Amino acid sequence: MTNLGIGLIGYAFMGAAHSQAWRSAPRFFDLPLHPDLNVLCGRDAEAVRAAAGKLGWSTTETDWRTLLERDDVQLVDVCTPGDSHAEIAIAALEAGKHVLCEKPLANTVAEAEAMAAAAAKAAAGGIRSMVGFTYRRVPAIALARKLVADGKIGTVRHVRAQYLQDWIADPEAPLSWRLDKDKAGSGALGDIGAHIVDLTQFITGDRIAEVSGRLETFVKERPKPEAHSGLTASAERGPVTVDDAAVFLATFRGGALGVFEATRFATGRKNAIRIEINGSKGSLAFDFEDMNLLHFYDATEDPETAGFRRILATEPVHPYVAGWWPPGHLLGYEHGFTHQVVDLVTAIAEGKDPEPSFADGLQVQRVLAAVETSSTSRQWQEIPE
Amino acid sequence: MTNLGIGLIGYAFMGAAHSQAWRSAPRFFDLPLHPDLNVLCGRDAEAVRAAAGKLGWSTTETDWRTLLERDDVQLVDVCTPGDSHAEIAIAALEAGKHVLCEKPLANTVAEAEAMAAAAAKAAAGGIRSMVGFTYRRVPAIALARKLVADGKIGTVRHVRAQYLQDWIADPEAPLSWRLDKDKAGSGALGDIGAHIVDLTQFITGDRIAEVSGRLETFVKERPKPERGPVTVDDAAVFLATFRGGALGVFEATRFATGRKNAIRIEINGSKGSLAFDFEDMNLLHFYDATEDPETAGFRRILATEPVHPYVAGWWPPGHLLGYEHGFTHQVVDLVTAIAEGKDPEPSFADGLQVQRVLAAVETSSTSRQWQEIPE
Amino acid sequence: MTNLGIGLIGYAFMGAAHSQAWRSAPRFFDLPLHPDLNVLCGRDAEAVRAAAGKLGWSTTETDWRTLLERDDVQLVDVCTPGDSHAEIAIAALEAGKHVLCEKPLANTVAEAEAMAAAAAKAAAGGIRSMVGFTYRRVPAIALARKLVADGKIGTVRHVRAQYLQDWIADPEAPLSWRLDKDKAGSGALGDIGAHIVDLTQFITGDRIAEVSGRLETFVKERPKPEAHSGLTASAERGPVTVDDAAVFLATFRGGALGVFEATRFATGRKNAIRIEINGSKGSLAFDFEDMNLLHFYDATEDPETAGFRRILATEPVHPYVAGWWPPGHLLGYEHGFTHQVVDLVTAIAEGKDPEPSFADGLQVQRVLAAVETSSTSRQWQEIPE
Amino acid sequence: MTNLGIGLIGYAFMGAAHSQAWRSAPRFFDLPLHPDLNVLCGRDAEAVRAAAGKLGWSTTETDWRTLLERDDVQLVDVCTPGDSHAEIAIAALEAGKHVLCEKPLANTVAEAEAMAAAAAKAAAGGIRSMVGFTYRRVPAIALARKLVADGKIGTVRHVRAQYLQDWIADPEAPLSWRLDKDKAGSGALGDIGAHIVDLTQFITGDRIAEVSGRLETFVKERPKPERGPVTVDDAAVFLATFRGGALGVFEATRFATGRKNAIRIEINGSKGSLAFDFEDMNLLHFYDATEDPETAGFRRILATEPVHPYVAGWWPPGHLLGYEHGFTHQVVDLVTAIAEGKDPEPSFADGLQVQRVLAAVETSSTSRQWQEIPE
Structure with missing residues (x-):
């Protein structure tokens, strides 16, 4: 392995900030694997195609679950709001995909506990995960x-x-x-x-x-x-x-x-x-x-x-x-x-x-x-x- | 009335900072009364005399209660730690002396309540008081x-x-x-x-x-x-x-x-x-x-x-x-x-x-x- | 025309700073033409190939003069030291290529005068030029x-x-x-x-x-x-x-x-x-x-x-x-x-x-x-x- | 010798800033001589008397030359504009008075040369001088x-x-x-x-x-x-x-x-x-x-x-x-x-x-x- 296939979920939220990082990293740093911007996920097919051309992604998928099936996705970057982190990250790890997840980790402690458990099991199988508290970097x-x-x-x-x-x-x-x-x-x-x-x-x-x-x-x-602001009412x-x-x-x-x-x-x-x-x-x-x-x-x-x-x-x-x-x-x-x-x-x-x-x-x-x-x-x- | 006689208690605590203010104020500001640095109080006779010479005070007293009796003390500046604020400030107000007191006002709420009560009655009789939260100025x-x-x-x-x-x-x-x-x-x-x-x-x-x-x-x-x-x-x-x-x-x-x-x-x-x-x-x-x-x-x-x-x-x-x-x-x-x-x-x-x-x-x-x- | 072909001369001096700009501009701004990183010039064929892969350029050329002949170069970005600005920019303008030139404009007033004359003649023919005093931006x-x-x-x-x-x-x-x-x-x-x-x-x-x-x-x-620093002499x-x-x-x-x-x-x-x-x-x-x-x-x-x-x-x-x-x-x-x-x-x-x-x-x-x-x-x- | 008598010329220019220094120095620092604010000079009698009261000077003089004669003036503080620095400072040094002079030293190099020459001779006789470039301090x-x-x-x-x-x-x-x-x-x-x-x-x-x-x-x-x-x-x-x-x-x-x-x-x-x-x-x-x-x-x-x-x-x-x-x-x-x-x-x-x-x-x-x- 010389390349690392990336799929990103949540372009509408952090797509620009995350995509520029995947594009720039191997150009400015000598990386041991080359990240490939392979798949951008979004339910609105026309909007996600447009975003993919802007942000540098080669293909798009409507259903995030599809990223977990593709051999050209080794790592899933989860950029959506907290309410979807547990569902997506746990599934990704269970599918043998490395995961980058935005902060905070989840919306509840119960969710975060389930994520931490999945991350532990995954790490035992060589599958890595990180929560993206960006300001540490x-x-x-x-x-x-x-x-x-x-x-x-x-x-x-x-x-x-x-x-x-x-x-x-x-x-x-x-x-x-x-x-x-x-x-x-x-x-x-x-x-x-x-x-x-x-x-x-x-x-x-x-x-x-x-x-x-x-x-x-x-x-x-x-x-x-x-709301209508006329010549904004309480209603x-x-x-x-x-x-x-x-x-x-x-x-x-x-x-x-x-x-x-x-x-x-x-x-x-x-x-x-x-x-x-x-x-x-x-x-x-x-x-x-x-x-x-x-x-x-x-x-x-x-x-x-x-x-x-x-x-x-x-x-x-x-x-x-x-x-x-x-x-x-x-x-x-x-x-x-x-x-x-x-x-x-x-x-x-x-x-x-x-x-x-x-x-x-x-x-x-x-x-x-x-x-x-x-x-x-x-x-x-x-x-x- | 043109002059305001000052007596200060607690020189060893805030003596330099308070005395420079009493000395400087009429030289830099056109004041309606001229503050006279009349009495510095301290129980150590030699130390308070030295401080009075350094700081610009005309006379000294061993017993703070003497300031309450002296006609040339119109205002008592209380610079001691909080444990003594209530006893001194209330006595001074009751003796018809204006009071400046350092912060905090006291060591307990009960002491502060007695101080504020005395200040209210005193103010109705034209006797003023202020707590010195200096950073306001x-x-x-x-x-x-x-x-x-x-x-x-x-x-x-x-x-x-x-x-x-x-x-x-x-x-x-x-x-x-x-x-x-x-x-x-x-x-x-x-x-x-x-x-x-x-x-x-x-x-x-x-x-x-x-x-x-x-x-x-x-x-x-x-x-x-x-x-x-x-x-x-x-x-x-x-x-x-x-x-x-x-x-x-x-x-x-x-x-x-x-x-x-x-x-x-x-x-x-x-x-x-x-x-x-x-x-x-x-x-x-x-x-x-x-x-x-x-x-x-x-x-x-x-x-x-x-x-x-x-x-x-x-x-x-x-x-x-x-x-x-x-x-x-x-x-x-x-x-x-x-x-x-x-x-x-x-x-x-x-x-x-x-x-x-x-x-x-x-x-x-x-x-x-x-x-x-x-x- | 929807695209604008770019050739860059002087990658060893400003290649990283200039290349990231050509890559990022259409992703962050809605540009009326899309810049294509087509040609990177360098005399050392192995080094320039390596640089092209790092910096995002599709082909390389040994001889800068070749950029002026290629139909896929509409604009020449000149990043070299001042001593070469007049020779390269004047030639580029005379070949009908738009020019971005680094500062200072030249090494002498005589050179800069020759460049300004060429720029005027070029502008009359619709060929544009700019000196890159970057801090204005x-x-x-x-x-x-x-x-x-x-x-x-x-x-x-x-x-x-x-x-x-x-x-x-x-x-x-x-x-x-x-x-x-x-x-x-x-x-x-x-x-x-x-x-x-x-x-x-x-x-x-x-x-x-x-x-x-x-x-x-x-x-x-x-x-x-x-120089040898032994146990640096004047010689x-x-x-x-x-x-x-x-x-x-x-x-x-x-x-x-x-x-x-x-x-x-x-x-x-x-x-x-x-x-x-x-x-x-x-x-x-x-x-x-x-x-x-x-x-x-x-x-x-x-x-x-x-x-x-x-x-x-x-x-x-x-x-x-x-x-x-x-x-x-x-x-x-x-x-x-x-x-x-x-x-x-x-x-x-x-x-x-x-x-x-x-x-x-x-x-x-x-x-x-x-x-x-x-x-x-x-x-x-x-x-x- | 324990006291150093001061006379100041040019109160209307730097009177407040210089006088506060003469007043404050012995109160905040342990000085080997005590500066006495003895004479304030000014030609407008009423104005200089008012300023002397404000600024802490014991007496006043109309003619700056009188400071050169008075035994209670040991040091002359010269605060006038530069046009008068040379005449005053040189006379003061020659009269055996220490001098503090404001900057710049003079209005011309020739005047400054005469001042430095007088200062050198005076210093050999124990009479000191300083130019007040205050920001050094x-x-x-x-x-x-x-x-x-x-x-x-x-x-x-x-x-x-x-x-x-x-x-x-x-x-x-x-x-x-x-x-x-x-x-x-x-x-x-x-x-x-x-x-x-x-x-x-x-x-x-x-x-x-x-x-x-x-x-x-x-x-x-x-x-x-x-x-x-x-x-x-x-x-x-x-x-x-x-x-x-x-x-x-x-x-x-x-x-x-x-x-x-x-x-x-x-x-x-x-x-x-x-x-x-x-x-x-x-x-x-x-x-x-x-x-x-x-x-x-x-x-x-x-x-x-x-x-x-x-x-x-x-x-x-x-x-x-x-x-x-x-x-x-x-x-x-x-x-x-x-x-x-x-x-x-x-x-x-x-x-x-x-x-x-x-x-x-x-x-x-x-x-x-x-x-x-x-x-």
Whole structure:
């Protein structure tokens, strides 16, 4: 085997971001297998043909189940909303196909448990799976993980993380699927809270032990998708059934305090994923709106010169950067997807289980469920270890 | 009446920062009364005499109660730890002396209630009082309040605030009174949590309704200045909802390695947002959500224009101010309130409401339950 | 015609950056013609075949002249060093091929004049040409141009620009082609000075009228490419024949003062292209290491709230951004190349002359020549209007 | 000897900023001599008496020459425009008075030469003098000098400096003495160009060798405080080489719309780089080029540690300082130099070398020729 046949399900949701990664990866990195964009799945035959020509896929299929039967599909990339992840990923693994699944892993803990079980059985048969928490593959974030691994942070006292967006801060913005509890599973919590739960656990190497949470919906009714705005009446609106924001306190198993905030109503903030970790030997700070920077404070340095150093994460020694451009020639949102592909293809070729695993996705799911339950119950909730 | 005699108690705690304000205020601002630095109080006779020479005070007294009798003390500035705030401030008010008292107002809600009760009765008799939440008088913070008052923020959805310091992040840093519950009341919570509770409430003009909190002590014993116990929190974190509906997220800690006095506030509303960091004290960032998306963004307002609060007393644009200036501004406002027959803000009633927030956070931590704040 | 056949010369220099643009442009933008990556040119047949498979080109040719004969080449992309631009671009235009040429336009004013003449004759016959000053197509930069065009800056008093890099700040870094006067034409001046001359003229819409300049070489000898470092002797080094840094004062035709600095010895600065323009109605500030931001001060705003606003250049109303990702989902160095392609393909389809033209490239060349002459002569030099 | 009597000339120009320094220095620093604010000079009797009350001066004099006779004036602080610096400072030195003189040292090189000559002779007789380039005493700038002295920057390749202000960017802003060549000597060049010339030379420890300059006046006539001519430059830009080989690029202007007091300096060397902006005064950024590329970068040093220059006199970490503090630091250093029998820096000789740089830039502009600076 020199090539790895790819089939993608969910082009309407993440097709552009995922497809560019499959196209670019072997051009910028020397991969042990060449990914072939073989099959794009979609029920609307004319729309999926159009998408296939735009995105670079050779054939299309109406029925996702067909991808699991085709010898030219070795790996299924599942990009749909959480409500369909368990059905599709479990089937794919049982059909002997490697799987890349978007986050969050599922819509319920029960689903995620079933996925983790299937992933374990599959791994025993050489069939690999990964949950695509893309921001782990931002070079600055991978660098932060390395600095912790190298011991430069020491005993972690504090984790603080915010994921601040504003894309529905306007109450007149209409209803859609990310606002429908049934497809999306949750709102801010599941969509963007998941990212920061996973990023903080990834960087520290520690896990959240207990949480105290509050979910809020600021705008509970919104114009229906084709409401009439005349010279919008009350009868033209429908209910919002997910959270607009989720906030929570945490303790980590190692003892650190954590403070988390994810919202779609942070007016002026667009994709501001903010993380700061404070430990006995140093601290790290990151903001995705400055994605190419990692700030690092060394607490062992002479107080005369100690301070957060601005590390421009564009050196060839930084994770992934060697595949791209010279120092100061910035990367962006899309590169992390390519880096995922590089790491997934490489794991498959080397017979290794990719990270984050479905088991890792399940633990994240358990944190999300605990925050939600904590909000409704008004009680702290422990996370199964 | 042209002069206002001042007596100060607690020089060893805040003596330098308060004295520079009393000295500077009439030189930089045209005040309706001239503050006279008349009496410095301290029980160590040699130490208080030295401090009086250094700090600009004309006479000294061993017994704080003597300030209550002296005709040349019109106003008592109380800078001791919270354990002594109630006894001193209430006596002073009852003796017909105006009072400035440091934060937090007291060590317990019951003490704060007695203080606010005395202040209310005293104010009806023309005797003024103020609690010194100094960061209100940072020009950028006063400007933030003004932008809210002008309607530029709209319906507030989020309040986030952090007060990040690292001064005891070293486990071998020694005990002091700030680590002693019997002196300070609490640790991070009362010392720096109080500041951000008050700052967010002041800027928004709204009040916290309920909280969920957790206090933590990372280092439980330290060297004496032999070793002893740390009996307060090193950090306090809490969720909040505000009466107007906003979600709040608060974090105050002495263990944020690399952060020195980072008071960070962001407020997000339907019409705009504000952001501030004290380590960039001279800046306020303001995003106008009603602006064309082509150019909408947080604008960096350098708070050094003569139209900005207090700045006209000082230096030209870009000629930065710092930590000490807010104390002078406190003095300007307090002296002017007294002269004009007005009650200064924050009032002891305001101080009491903050105390109730602090008590709720602490009680939430131990009980593991959400706690409502009385109105 | 629905397709536009591309041939690229100079893959070893800019092949990755240019090829990704030709591949991505029709996938992210709805182009009036589809660019086909038909021919990659290179004299080393085995190396160019390898490059063609990596970069996405269908065939290769040994002799660049062959591209000018092929009916499947409509447009020649010239990526080589300045020393070959005039020979290749003039020939291409005379063969009826559209041309994209890298900056600077040439190595001498005489060459650039010959290129501008050929471009004029070609344009009369419907054959288009552009000089690829890529940073004009950074969305923040295009936005800055729009704000000026909209009148928001007013009378310009000051232009300040720096291009700060450090890639040869180490004296032991060895000799190469960008250090050889004969291929490169100059060092910092021609390489990175050209970028800031053009960016400031583009944004303001004004031209430099006179300059006072100084060129410097800090490290005049460097280890030869295969020098022996034993237990590096003096005999193992060779001379550096270009400038390491170029600084100059300018006045603009409208009256503004300009202050320019380009260097390869700004230790710690990687690709920091810094521009600030101050005018009667407002000011603009930009730093490529924060490429996704434009800072804009409105001088007509109430002093109570006037200040530089941080514009995150990721709204769909900002130039080019609609083709990419949602707000806060950052772009990077590579996107400007794609935007060049979009604008070039669109100009060709619409029968318009692309900007910057070869004539615009010539005027830049005249500024560069004046700075160099000013340095040697120790006298101010006027730029032909 | 325990006290040092001060007399100040030029209150209407720098009276507030200099007086706060003389008042504050002994309260925050343990000084070997106590400065006594004894005499304020001014020809308008009522105005100078009011200012003396405001600013803390015990007596007043109409004639500046009277300060030269009075035994309670040991040190003359000269704050007038440059047109009067030479006459006053030389007379004071000759009368056996120590001198602090504002920048630039004078209006002409010839005047600066006479001042430096008098200062040299006076210093041999124990009479000290200093030119007040105040920004040297910003803690972050003093730290920058220390990092250079420690060898952390190595061989300097680049110096870039800007002093960006906008206070007369409005064409209708009125004339003042700062726009009058006969009072100020020059405009942006002498007022703010001088600061960045001295700052870069001080930090690097090197001197400018040659310059190519251009001065521009954007608004040539303005309203009086009827209209009159602006007889100075609004902006001064110049290239430089330093004696050690570095290239320098300098820009000073009053027309940088949106910039208020943005003094920006960056120094790039073989072993590291430094960057500073006064609008972020409490920060110094330091890049160590000898660091592993995995983590190399400019570190943000908050200049509020007790090991940083002067900071031990003030407030805890993160408790920011501002513009006024450098004046106090000047006083600390000047009083201590006098007490210890040392010559303070910058000296009048240092002031003269800066004057020669300014003269060269101006002469370069008019002649359109590069100009060398004498050593």
